[PDB]
């Protein structure tokens, strides 16, 4: 008939990929990096403590100048911080208080945010008047917004909990592309360092590599036992690290199509809310919900650091574009800026 | 510097408006409005006036924010910790669903489908100390329907008596036994009536009592 042999060819074509992943898996990244020395115990101290948010911080994003950073909280405020001098540049009141994501434009002119109202609002930071106003509100998603990320001042890609990603055009305000491959809620995005690709991980325990120009999923990466909560690209753009409710982080490779490392420990049993790399790709930072960030040696899979300054769930974390600092926002209403001491 | 000491005093005009708006927001009452769908969730917001639908109904010098989440067709476990610090949860259950079954795949009879969701919300880890203002909506619209068919189609281990004021007692106790956290929080139960004032006065009466027991626990008295 016809009801079964395409279901069995989807079984066949999923057998077509698995041993083709196995044939290209002759050794492990642990064995090839078995000769290198570890990075040592990475000690970082809280340089700055950014305070003024009055509820749980849900997202933060740095500017590209490595000094300004936007942070989102559910007291209804979007705050641009000066990270050097701990002082506020702007505080933006939002329409909906249910903001789950925030983004900084790579030019600095715009800040996006979205959440449970199913729209990504765009904010003009540099106006001829002295305020910050909403330029566009991008409606068209059916589920909550999980991640907004700018390509440039006119293009932004969003993620949503209606199992779809979308590429928008901020001038006209409508989706030029829709990215429909996921079956669960999509929880995070990460743009490549050339912005011709991106990766999104979802609650169906899979992450998908998408083409921005064509609109089609290139590769789909499995390997997790629960919802993927955080995606970050490696600085090469040829790898990406995930973070799940599985209490595990996995490093995938695009040109080898499969999972290389697995960043886990015996005592950790709680989820991973945030994933970021450092400027070298040598350290992997990961925010957990047993209230502390854990710096992972990305090549040796050893917990080579701990950032233990937060009283609640470490909710967001990012590293600057020059790798000089790392901020961690959290549910105890504080962003802490950490730096290694000479 | 001269221009960095004006950047500092702008930044503590940011700060004294963040502090001023965040203390006018800790005074208002936040309320989730959950339910099972068509279980009277619109006639309560009709008495108090595409993602969240926030509704504001300041009643007796008490600003009430009521967040309806019924249009979120996603996994509830991914966004429900946003409502973790919330004053109460207003739960609506239609009493006129004690006989009609769920039409999906001949499922449970649509009050167990509500009991799927009352147990999941009450015993949740984010709502381990959040009082629930439980509403039993269609009181008159099943009282004429309980005289035709008894209260045995859903709960077969009922005592009997086939009438209203034991079905109004057995069903109410059949929801308040799902509270497996009884020392931490309370379930308040109401029957939704045609009186336009008695249904918002119960939300004002029951949420004053959440504020008391929060102010007793924040001190040493609890």
């Amino acid at each position, epitope marked *: 008939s016809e009801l079964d042999q395409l279901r069995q060819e989807a079984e066949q074509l999923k057998n077509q990929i698995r041993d083709a992943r196995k044939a290209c898996a002759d050794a492990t990244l642990s064995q090839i990096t078995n000769n290198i020395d570890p990075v040592g115990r990475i000690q970082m101290r809280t340089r700055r403590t950014l305070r003024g948010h009055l509820a749980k911080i849900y997202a933060m994003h740095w500017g590209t100048d490595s000094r*300004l950073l936007v942070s989102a909280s559910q007291d209804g405020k979007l705050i641009i911080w000066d990270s050097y001098t701990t002082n506020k540049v702007h505080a933006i009141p939002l329409r909906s208080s249910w903001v789950m994501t925030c983004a900084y434009a790579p030019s*600095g002119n715009y800040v996006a945010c979205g959440g449970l109202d199913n729209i990504c609002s765009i904010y003009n930071l540099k106006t001829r*008047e002295g305020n910050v106003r909403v330029s566009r509100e991008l409606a068209g998603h059916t589920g909550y917004l999980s991640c907004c990320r700018f390509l440039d001042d006119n293009q932004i890609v969003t993620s949503s909990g209606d199992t779809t990603c979308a590429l928008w055009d901020i001038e006209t305000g409508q989706q030029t592309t829709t990215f429909t491959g996921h079956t669960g809620d999509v929880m995070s995005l990460s743009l490549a360092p050339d912005t011709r690709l991106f990766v999104s991980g979802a609650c169906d325990a899979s992450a998908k590599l998408w083409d921005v120009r064509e609109g089609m999923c290139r590769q789909t990466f499995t390997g997790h036992e629960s919802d993927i909560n955080a995606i970050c690209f490696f600085p090469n753009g040829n790898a990406f690290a995930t973070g799940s409710d599985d209490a595990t982080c996995r490093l995938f490779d695009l040109r080898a199509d499969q999972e290389l490392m697995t960043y886990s420990h015996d005592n950790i049993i709680c989820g991973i809310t945030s994933v970021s790399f450092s400027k070298s790709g040598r350290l992997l930072l990961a925010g957990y919900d047993d209230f502390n960030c854990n710096v992972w040696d990305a090549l040796k899979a050893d917990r080579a650091g701990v950032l233990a300054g937060h009283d609640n769930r470490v909710s967001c974390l990012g590293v600057t574009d020059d790798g000089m600092a790392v901020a961690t926002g959290s549910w105890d209403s504080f962003l802490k800026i950490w730096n290694g001491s000479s | *510097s001269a221009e960095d000491k004006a*950047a500092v*005093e702008r930044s503590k005009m940011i700060d004294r408006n963040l502090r001023e708006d965040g203390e006018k927001a800790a005074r208002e009452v936040k309320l989730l409005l959950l339910g099972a769908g068509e279980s009277g969730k619109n006639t309560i917001v009709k008495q108090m006036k595409t993602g969240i639908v926030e509704t504001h109904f300041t009643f007796k010098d008490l600003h009430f924010k009521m967040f309806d989440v019924g249009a979120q067709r996603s996994e509830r476990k991914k966004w429900i910790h946003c409502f973790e610090g919330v004053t109460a949860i207003i739960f609506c259950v239609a009493l006129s669903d004690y006989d009609l079954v769920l039409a999906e795949d001949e499922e449970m009879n649509r009050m167990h489908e509500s009991m799927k969701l009352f147990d999941s919300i009450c015993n949740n880890k984010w709502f381990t100390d959040t009082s629930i203002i439980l509403f039993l909506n269609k009181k008159d619209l099943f009282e004429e329907k309980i005289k035709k068919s008894p209260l045995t189609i859903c709960y077969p281990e009922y005592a009997g008596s086939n009438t209203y004021e034991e079905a109004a007692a057995y069903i109410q106790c059949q929801f308040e036994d799902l509270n497996k956290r009884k020392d931490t929080k309370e379930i308040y139960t109401h029957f939704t009536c045609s009186t336009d004032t008695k249904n918002v006065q119960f939300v004002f009466d029951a949420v004053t009592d959440v504020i008391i027991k929060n102010n007793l626990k924040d001190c040493g008295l609890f």
Partner: single-chain antibody
Amino acid sequence: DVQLVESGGGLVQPGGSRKLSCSASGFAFSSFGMHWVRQAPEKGLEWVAYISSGSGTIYYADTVKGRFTISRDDPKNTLFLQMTSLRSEDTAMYYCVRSIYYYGSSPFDFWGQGTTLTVSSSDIVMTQATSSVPVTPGESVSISCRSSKSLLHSNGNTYLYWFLQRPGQSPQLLIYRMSNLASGVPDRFSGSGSGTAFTLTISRLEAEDVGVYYCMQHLEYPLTFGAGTKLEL
């Protein structure tokens, strides 16, 4: 458009008193610090007063301190300057300048149209040793300005500003903090310098680049201008 238009004054006897009033329109007045900058007839600019956003910090010039007082009312978007004991060195055209200070902002960017006042009958010195340059279009000019104290600061930026008063007009900001071009300024203008000596470079002169080119510092109050450099055509 953003609009600052000031009124009040025009003729007053010496020893008298006049209240100036700048009425703002088209921007968020409460977020800007406001200055007054006056200009004596056939002379240069000099700074008068300042109030921060929120009116919690007031400065004055040492020439007018005690006599003048500056105030705002943000629900009415209006800037005031109450002047008592009006001397004969106070006859000037008074400008109303808006100014915002956060990280990366552009202060002194929009100037008012200027009201005139006619009265009948230590710090940083900014020197522009050139007062006038003959020039034709197509030329590249490099206007220099010198400061007594070093304008570079420890936080890393050099607080030198550049302005252009076209004839019959109000000054417009060209360069803020010695190197950053203002909004709406063509790319021909370019500022540079180091610490004590600075130069402003125009690449190709047009029919609109003619006026007086002032340099101002913002390192500490008082804000001292230079005597401007005229570019005649």
